[PDB]
Ligand binder design. Structure first.
Ligand SMILES: COC(=O)N[C@H](C(=O)NN(Cc1ccccc1)C[C@@](O)(Cc1ccccc1)C(=O)N[C@H]1c2ccccc2C[C@H]1O)C(C)C
Lengths: 99, 99
């Protein structure tokens, strides 16, 4: 669909059988979700935001459904204020910015 | 124009007679720019992101040009790692997310 920006672009996502709300963020290189349990081994990663850096857990090849669209990619988990969908997954569902 | 997300969505902006590079961020409520001088009175404010909060100076009624389009709005100035155009200005140029 076409999403306007008068309010935060929040959509519902499905991961691990659970529904969660997440923000579509074109300014984020990666996707990071609030603390939760995911399968497999994880690797360490550092990501920087406006207030500094934070350590997160990187999980690969995770299935995640965004507004009915299925994507399979890298997902980070850590102390984030809100669940964030970044460019790595936005390109998989074919999302573009238009004006 | 239509902008793909394989790379960071950076564009050229004009403000205060100066040309700068900025990131179109749908995950940002406000617009924040690296330290610079702007006319008018300002108010202190605290904004939060990944990593924590930072203090910035808030300027109201500022004019900016984004890829030829003119927009008016509140602009925050502070120690941000990169110039960010947020929803408060993206709406004024008719920017939308599509997939
Ligand atoms: C390369 O690193 C990266 O891509 N990091 C990414 C990142 O920090 N992304 N954004 C852009 C960014 C920031 C710093 C450096 C580069 C790029 C910022 C963000 O949208 C995320 C965010 C954070 C908390 C809540 C909601 C959204 C944000 O900070 N939003 C806040 C903001 C920004 C400006 C003015 C006001 C406000 C309030 C709030 O909306 C992470 C991997 C997610």
């Amino acid at each position: 669909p076409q999403i306007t920006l008068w309010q935060r672009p929040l959509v519902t996502i499905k991961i691990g059988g659970q529904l969660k709300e997440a923000l579509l963020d074109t300014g984020a290189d990666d996707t990071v979700l609030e603390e939760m349990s995911l399968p497999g081994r994880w690797k360490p990663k550092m990501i920087g935001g406006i207030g500094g850096f934070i350590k997160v857990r990187q999980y690969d090849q995770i299935l995640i459904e965004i507004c009915g669209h299925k994507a399979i990619g890298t997902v980070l988990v850590g102390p984030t204020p809100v669940n964030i969908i970044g460019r790595n997954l936005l390109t998989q569902i074919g999302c573009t910015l238009n004006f």
